[PDB]
Structure formats: structure tokens, C-alpha cells
Design a protein around this ligand. Structure first.
Ligand code: CA
Length: 305
């Protein structure tokens, strides 16, 4: 059974010099992984050091270059890849125009945004245009982690242990996942999904802790200004992926909280190269219908394939 994978990364060497298997030129290594793991399509997004974290004209020009080079690559292998836009978030009106260009000119099927803006989370009024654009284009936004701000690193992650421990704790060990979950909650609480009810967002790492507390948020997080309960937005406007963390207890929690229709597959290639990607869905006690949904059908519907 073939899959569509949603959190698969690339970088461009020349863009990296300005800002190894992640390099877009490493085509054969990418295809070997996909073929061996029964992956039909990788949805490609910029990886480490994305130009989306830069400011002004430089951020604009480097995102345009990344998107153009990605589109040239997909045009060579159109049956195996779909593109997600890289946006200069620190320039929101320019980001919304680049989003439109990616969808309408480049044939991309959404955007992946790493971290947050230089001035905070994307619930701020100035970023509303990005979400409005995504709904208008009928495409999702994948909200991905990135390094936390220095004030969070110093308050929460530095402690009585080595610096390498503090850095990994702040990043992929825990911290940047806590951060992206909080960012996604800001988006819900700000009413983005009441303004743009057809908008869908995607989050990785089994929901960035959010599914652990859905029932508790409905009971304890006061949000009477929204049209729906807090949990409703995660069940109806979000999709969740594993990001190559192929662990059953988290899958079971996510299935009970959001349901099978909201789960998409993802490997986090090449930062994770999960050897069990092609067999994991067979170890969860799922029906063939459920396996088909997670592997390809939920994603094919979302991407309009
Ligand atoms: Ca990733």
C-alpha cells in the first residue's frame, strides 16, 4: 500500500550559504528511501535554516528562489512530489503574494511555516492576511517547530546540567514541540477558524502535545468569544502527523481524540529515515479502510489529488 508523506524536507546549498541528504541535489538517496518504504509522494518543504526566518527584501528574494528551484525539481518528477510554499512570514503582505504565486503559478498545494515571526506568534493582526490567503486558495498551512526565543531558552531550558542537555531539551527533545503547540492554540483562541472556517492546518509530532489536553482545555480554558469549543477546532480544522515518530501509544491517543479522518502520514525525511515507515500502519490493529485513510486518502482529498 502506497503513501503520501507530509513532512519531508529539502534545502538548497546556495541558499544555505546565504542564510547532507536534505540537499535537493540528493535525488537518488531520496528515491531509494521512498521506494523502499512504499512512499508514492513526498510533500516537500524547506528544512533547517529556512529563509522564512530572515527579514525584509533578503527573506522575500531567498523564499522566491527556494520555491522556483523546488518547482523546477518537481517538474522533472511530477508523479513523486508535491510542493509546499516557503514564505517570508516577517513580510506578511509579501508572504501572501508569494503564497498566491506558489499555488497559482508553481502548482504547489499549501505552505509549511517554521517557528514564528521576529515579533511573536502568528495570531497578531498583521499576519491575518496569510490565513485569509490560504482559505481563499483552499490549501492547508503546516505549522512546524523552530528554535525557541532566547528568553524562553534561558527561563525554561537552561538548568543544572550540561549545555548540550539544555540545547537538545529546548529543541527536538521537548522545547520546540511545546512551543509549536502553544503557537497553534494561539491561532485557535484568536478566532482565525471562525473568520476562515474552511481553513485547515497541519501539525506534526503527534499534535505537539495538544491531544494530551483536549478534554482539559474544554473544561478549563475560558474561550466564550469563539463559536465552538476549543477541542472542536482541533477535530475539524487540524490534521495531525507522526513526523517519523512511529510509536503506538501516541497513535492510539490521537485516534481517540481527533479520529482517523484527521491523521496524515509523514517521515521527517531525511532528519529521520524510519526503517519501519512501510510496515508501521500494519502494527496498529487498524481496518484496511483506516490504513488507506492514513496512508493516502485523507491526504489525496486535502491536496485535491
Ligand atoms: Ca521536520
Amino acid at each position: 500500500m502506497k503513501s503520501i508523506t507530509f513532512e519531508e524536507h529539502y534545502v538548497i546549498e546556495d541558499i544555505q550559504k546565504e542564510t547532507n541528504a536534505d540537499e535537493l541535489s540528493h535525488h537518488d538517496e531520496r528515491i531509494q528511501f521512498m521506494n523502499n518504504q512504499d512512499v508514492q509522494i513526498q510533500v516537500l518543504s524547506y528544512g533547517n535554516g529556512s529563509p522564512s526566518n530572515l527579514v525584509g527584501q533578503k527573506a522575500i528574494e531567498l523564499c522566491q528562489k527556494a520555491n522556483d528551484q523546488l518547482a523546477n525539481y518537481i517538474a522533472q518528477y511530477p508523479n513523486r512530489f508535491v510542493g509546499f510554499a516557503t514564505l517570508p512570514i516577517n513580510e506578511p503582505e509579501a508572504a501572501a503574494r508569494e503564497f498566491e504565486r506558489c499555488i497559482n503559478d508553481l502548482g504547489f498545494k499549501g505552505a509549511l511555516i517554521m517557528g514564528r515571526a521576529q515579533d511573536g506568534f502568528l495570531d497578531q493582526d498583521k499576519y491575518d492576511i496569510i490565513f485569509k490567503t490560504a482559505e481563499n486558495l483552499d490549501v492547508p498551512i503546516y505549522l512546524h517547530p523552530a528554535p525557541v526565543n532566547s528568553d524562553i531558552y534561558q527561563s525554561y531550558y537552561k538548568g543544572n546540567y550540561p549545555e548540550v542537555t539544555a540545547a537538545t531539551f529546548a529543541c527536538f527533545g521537548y522545547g520546540w514541540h511545546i512551543d509549536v503547540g502553544i503557537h497553534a492554540i494561539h491561532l485557535v483562541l484568536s478566532g482565525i477558524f471562525d473568520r476562515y472556517p474552511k481553513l485547515n492546518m497541519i501539525i506534526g509530532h503527534w499534535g505537539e502535545f495538544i491531544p494530551f489536553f483536549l478534554e482539559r482545555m474544554d473544561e478549563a480554558l475560558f474561550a466564550e468569544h469563539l463559536n465552538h469549543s476549543v477541542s472542536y477546532y482541533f477535530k475539524n480544522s487540524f490534521y495531525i502527523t507522526p513526523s517519523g515518530m512511529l510509536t503506538k501509544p501516541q497513535f492510539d491517543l490521537v485516534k481517540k481524540e481527533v479520529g482517523i479522518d484527521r491523521i496524515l502520514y509523514a517521515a521527517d525525511y531525511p532528519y529521520i529515515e524510519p526503517e519501519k515507515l512501510g510496515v508501521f500502519l500494519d502494527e496498529l490493529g487498524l481496518t484496511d479502510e483506516e490504513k488507506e485513510k492514513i496512508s493516502y486518502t485523507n491526504g489525496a482529498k486535502l491536496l485535491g489529488l
